[PDB]
């Protein structure tokens, strides 16, 4: 209703929306204008990552939490920046895509695990460093 509503709106726009489009639960033009703009840099991050290596894994809610937590907590132990927030989002989308693929009905667990982490561990950093507007400025970068 208050600060929770702000935090909920930010995470929904920046994280949940892209995962639901990476997952085919939601079409491309179901996205807010803010979302297809930042989709570009998330999409580009995904392709940059697929050059590097491929991901293959998860059978239980318990296994999603430990595997997801382990990676992301190691992703930000060192430092937090908008570039690795992209990787966080992207990584969250790739584990959700795995779930809807296997039709295990665990993608919901992925979204909620990523949401919880971004709220507790990332949102104070992102708010103080420009938040939603900055990630929008971060999306432009070099259009090569």
């Amino acid at each position: 209703e208050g600060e929770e509503l702000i935090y909920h709106n930010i995470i929904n726009e920046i994280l949940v929306g892209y995962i639901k489009y990476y997952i085919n639960d939601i079409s491309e033009h179901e996205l807010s204008p803010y979302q297809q703009q930042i989709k570009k840099i998330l999409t580009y991050y995904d392709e940059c990552l697929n050059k590097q290596v491929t991901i293959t894994f998860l059978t239980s809610v318990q296994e999603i939490k430990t595997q997801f937590t382990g990676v992301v907590t190691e992703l930000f132990k060192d430092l937090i920046n908008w570039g690795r927030i992209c990787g966080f989002i992207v990584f969250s989308a790739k584990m959700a895509k795995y779930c809807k693929d296997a039709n295990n009905h665990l993608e919901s667990t992925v979204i909620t695990t990523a949401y919880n982490f971004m709220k507790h561990n990332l949102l104070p950093w992102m708010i103080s460093h420009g938040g939603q507007e900055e990630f929008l400025a971060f999306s432009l970068h070099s259009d090569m």
């Binding site: 840099i41 908008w82 570039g83 990787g87």
Partner: peptide, 19 residues
């Protein structure tokens, strides 16, 4: 593994955070 994926996610994120 998992520790190596992070450093991949890290340095990619680091490369995009440039300039």
């Amino acid at each position: 593994s998992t520790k190596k994926l992070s450093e991949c996610l890290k340095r990619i994120g680091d490369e995009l955070d440039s300039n």
